[PDB]
Structure 1
Amino acid sequence: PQQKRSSPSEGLCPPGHHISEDGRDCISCKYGQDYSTHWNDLLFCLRCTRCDSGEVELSPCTTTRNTVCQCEEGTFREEDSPEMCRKCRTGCPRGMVKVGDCTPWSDIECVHKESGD
């Protein structure tokens, strides 16, 4: 009933750690470098992501959560454009009115994508 640091529960280590090779200890992930979000048996924690020059960091990487990055103001990203933030349109085309402003996850929304006038 006496111990020290970390041992695997049912063969799984806690978030913020990874498991030893065969010897079985639970090693901590390195803050700012890698992490693990769930109980696991990874031999290596997961590498943190670095926000690129077109993004801003909302929260840093921790041994428990990956960095959270977001497109910089004036640009946005969607499900089919995960690779590069796209420049938001300044205004709607001739004949169409706003209705939706630029978000980090969406360009401007313009109406006459049905409506009268």
Structure 2
Amino acid sequence: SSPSEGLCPPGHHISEDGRDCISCKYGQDYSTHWNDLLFCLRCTRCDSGEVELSPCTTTRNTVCQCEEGTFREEDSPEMCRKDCTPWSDI
């Protein structure tokens, strides 16, 4: 709750007054780096067709991955396009 040289540890955020380092609620926000954000980066949420592969830690966003049967790719990270893997077609 004290900024080591203006920054605050990962999982917290600076204050308006600039004094304390408040932490990011679980599965609602976070900071995976030493920051000075007046707010903690909101957490992503997976949607049907996506299976949560990893909790949104207070210092690591949630990781979502296509359901079984569908994959993503670097040019199509917006929707899960129907051997097959979670990042490649068969």
Matches of 1:105 and 1:59, distance apart in 2: 16
TM-score, structure 1 length as denominator?
0.75
1:107 has 2:89 as partner: yes
**Whose strand fraction is larger, Structure 1's or Structure 2's?**
1
Q: Which consecutive unaligned segments of at least 5 residues does structure 2 have?
A: none
Matches of 1:54 and 1:74, distance apart in 2: 9
Aligned-residue offset at 1:41: 0.3
Aligned-residue offset at 1:24: 1.3
Q: Deviations over 1:18-77 (max 9, x none)?
A: 001124100011111000000000000000001011100011111111001100111000
State which structure, 1 or 2, has the greater radius of gyration over its C-alpha atoms.
1
Higher relative contact order (CA 8 A, sep 6+): 2
Q: Identity of aligned pairs, percent?
A: 100
Count residues in correspondence.
90
**RMSD in angstroms over aligned alpha carbons?**
0.7
What stretches of structure 1 move > 4 A for 4+ residues in a row? none
Q: Deviations over 1:64-101 (max 9, x none)?
A: 110011001110000011110001xxxxxxxxxxxxx1
TM-score, structure 2 length as denominator?
0.96
